Design a protein around this ligand. Structure first.
Ligand SMILES: [Cl-]
Ligand SMILES: [Cl-]
Ligand SMILES: [Mg+2]
Ligand SMILES: [Mg+2]
Length: 284
């Protein structure tokens, strides 16, 4: 196997890195225009094209978007969380499954896991201290004005949710956030919720929006000192970054080093930034 694609040459948004111990490889699934493409790497530095991990059949509910895939290993299988929409169906995140970290994925159920009555995106998976799965998602600011982030328990098989979605916070609660104007609306974006649990049980959430100071896309963090997914979430006043980058997640590499992965800048030349990250005084 040859890995000839330098990480510096990658052009993509919202990079989620799957660290797969089973095959001892890293996988980067990405939106490749109405399909999900997957690249593979031994070391995060050089990459190999492994083809398409998801191409929708004509009967798939969501024929549009294919935004921001995440892939999780869960109880021996692999689950792709990607956002879609269709004529006559609101945008939402749905879950697809494969026996392999590189796909092919098939729909777990043929509908969004996010609420059908809501425009939603960026559905992600958090596994809590007891091993139980949570869905985190955004309700789009074009609908809500002040963008919203929700949590909701998932059934053990990830096919359905339990209970009602719970509103964690609105984007305006973070002091660094500034409103943007698009599609006739001025409001605050919520993108990319992702929770990392610290050894003491406290939770950090990363998420993205635009900064009030300079209009840059950015990564913000919030802390739930209670260890409760539902909060209360306390927003940190400063963004992690000033490089117009966002949609971040964190992972431990094969050596156990904590890393962050996100794209920067936010237009024209978006590329993955994958770099070590550190926890100090309970936050990033
Ligand atoms: Cl399909
Ligand atoms: Cl995983
Ligand atoms: Mg993502
Ligand atoms: Mg609102």
């Amino acid at each position: 196997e040859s890995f000839t694609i330098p990480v510096s040459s990658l052009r993509l948004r919202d990079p989620f890195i799957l660290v797969d111990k089973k095959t001892s490889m890293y996988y980067l699934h990405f939106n490749n225009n109405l399909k999900i493409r997957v690249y593979k790497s031994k070391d995060l530095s050089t990459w190999k094209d492994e083809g398409y991990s998801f191409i929708a059949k004509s009967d798939f509910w969501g024929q549009q978007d294919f935004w921001a895939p995440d892939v999780y290993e869960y109880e021996g299988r692999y689950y792709l969380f990607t956002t879609f929409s269709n004529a006559g169906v609101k945008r939402g995140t749905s879950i697809l499954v494969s026996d392999s970290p590189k796909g092919p994925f098939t729909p777990l159920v043929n509908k969004a896991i996010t609420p059908s009555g809501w425009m939603c995106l960026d559905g992600s998976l958090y596994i809590d201290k007891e091993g139980n799965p949570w869905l985190l998602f955004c309700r789009e600011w074009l609908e809500t004005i002040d963008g919203e982030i929700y949590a909701q328990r998932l059934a053990k098989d990830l096919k359905t949710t339990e209970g009602d979605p719970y509103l964690l916070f609105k984007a305006s609660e973070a002091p660094w956030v500034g409103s943007i104007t698009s599609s006739g609306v001025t409001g605050n974006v919520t993108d990319a919720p992702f929770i990392y649990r610290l050894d003491d049980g406290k939770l950090i959430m990363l998420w993205s929006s635009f900064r009030k100071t300079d209009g840059k896309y950015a990564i913000g963090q919030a802390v739930s000192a209670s260890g409760n997914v539902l909060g209360p979430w306390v927003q940190e006043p400063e963004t992690l970054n000033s490089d117009d980058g966002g949609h971040a997640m964190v992972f431990k590499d094969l050596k156990g080093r904590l890393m962050i992965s996100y794209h920067a800048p936010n237009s024209q030349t978006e590329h993955p930034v994958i770099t070590p990250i550190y926890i100090k005084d309970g936050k990033f």
